[PDB]
């Protein structure tokens, strides 16, 4: 990438830019996700991909740079949120209750003071509906609402 080094002299210097890995097993895709057979094969667990696709301060890169499709760009967005709040990204800081699979920001969720009757119960959302299309290695499907 490039860096803006200032000291008053200020300059922009390009340093240490990577490239593709030597082989994609399924080339001729449009996105790296579609090119490495990861269309429906990641989660919030794996912070390898999620570490690749983010800025060093926890933000993402725009889709015009990474070349992702819209579907898995939104999926990577939600997985960044789910992995940051679960505490899986401790080195991408701006400068205590344990969680995982947190869809919404924990600062702006109202408690369910009155859950409804058995036919109108207000459920607790777990996981995200963007990851609904994952590969189903479980006999019963994901329960996204608890």
Residue in 77, 26, 86, 18 with CA at minimum distance from that of residue 53: 77
Is 69 near Zn ion (CB under 5 A)?
A: yes
* Spatial separation of the C-alpha atoms in residues 16 and 18, rounded to whole Å: 6
63-to-11, 66, 74 alpha-carbon distances in Å: 27, 5, 10
Find how far residue 74's CA is from the centre of its chain: 8
Q: Considering only residues 41 through 100, tell me which ones interact with RNA, judged by CB under 7 A.
A: 43-45, 55, 57-64, 73, 77, 80-81, 84-85, 89, 92-94
For the chain, how big is the Rg over CA atoms in Å? 19
Task: Report the site for RNA in 98-117 (rule: CB under 7 A).
Answer: 101, 104-109, 113-117
Q: Which does 18 bind (CB under 5 to 8 A by kind): Zn ion, other proteins, RNA, none?
A: other proteins
Give contact residues for other proteins (rule: CB under 8 A). 1-4, 12, 14, 17-21, 25-26, 28-32, 34-43, 45-49, 51-52, 55-56, 61, 65-67, 69-71, 86-91, 100, 134-135, 137
């Amino acid at each position: 990438f490039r860096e803006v080094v200032e000291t008053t002299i200020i300059e922009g210097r390009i340093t240490a830019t990577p490239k593709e890995s030597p082989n994609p097993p399924n080339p001729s895709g449009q996105c790296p996700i579609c090119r490495w057979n990861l269309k429906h094969k990641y989660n919030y667990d794996d912070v390898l991909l999620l570490s690749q696709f983010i800025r060093p301060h926890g933000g993402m890169l725009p889709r015009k740079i990474t070349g992702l499709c819209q579907e898995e760009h939104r999926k990577i967005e939600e997985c960044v949120k789910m992995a940051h709040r679960a505490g899986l990204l401790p080195n991408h800081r701006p400068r205590q209750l344990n969680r995982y699979l947190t869809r919404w920001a924990p600062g702006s969720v109202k408690p369910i003071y009155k859950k409804g009757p058995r036919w109108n119960r207000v459920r607790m959302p777990v996981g995200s509906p963007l990851l609904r299309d994952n590969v189903c290695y479980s006999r019963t499907p994901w329960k996204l609402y608890h």
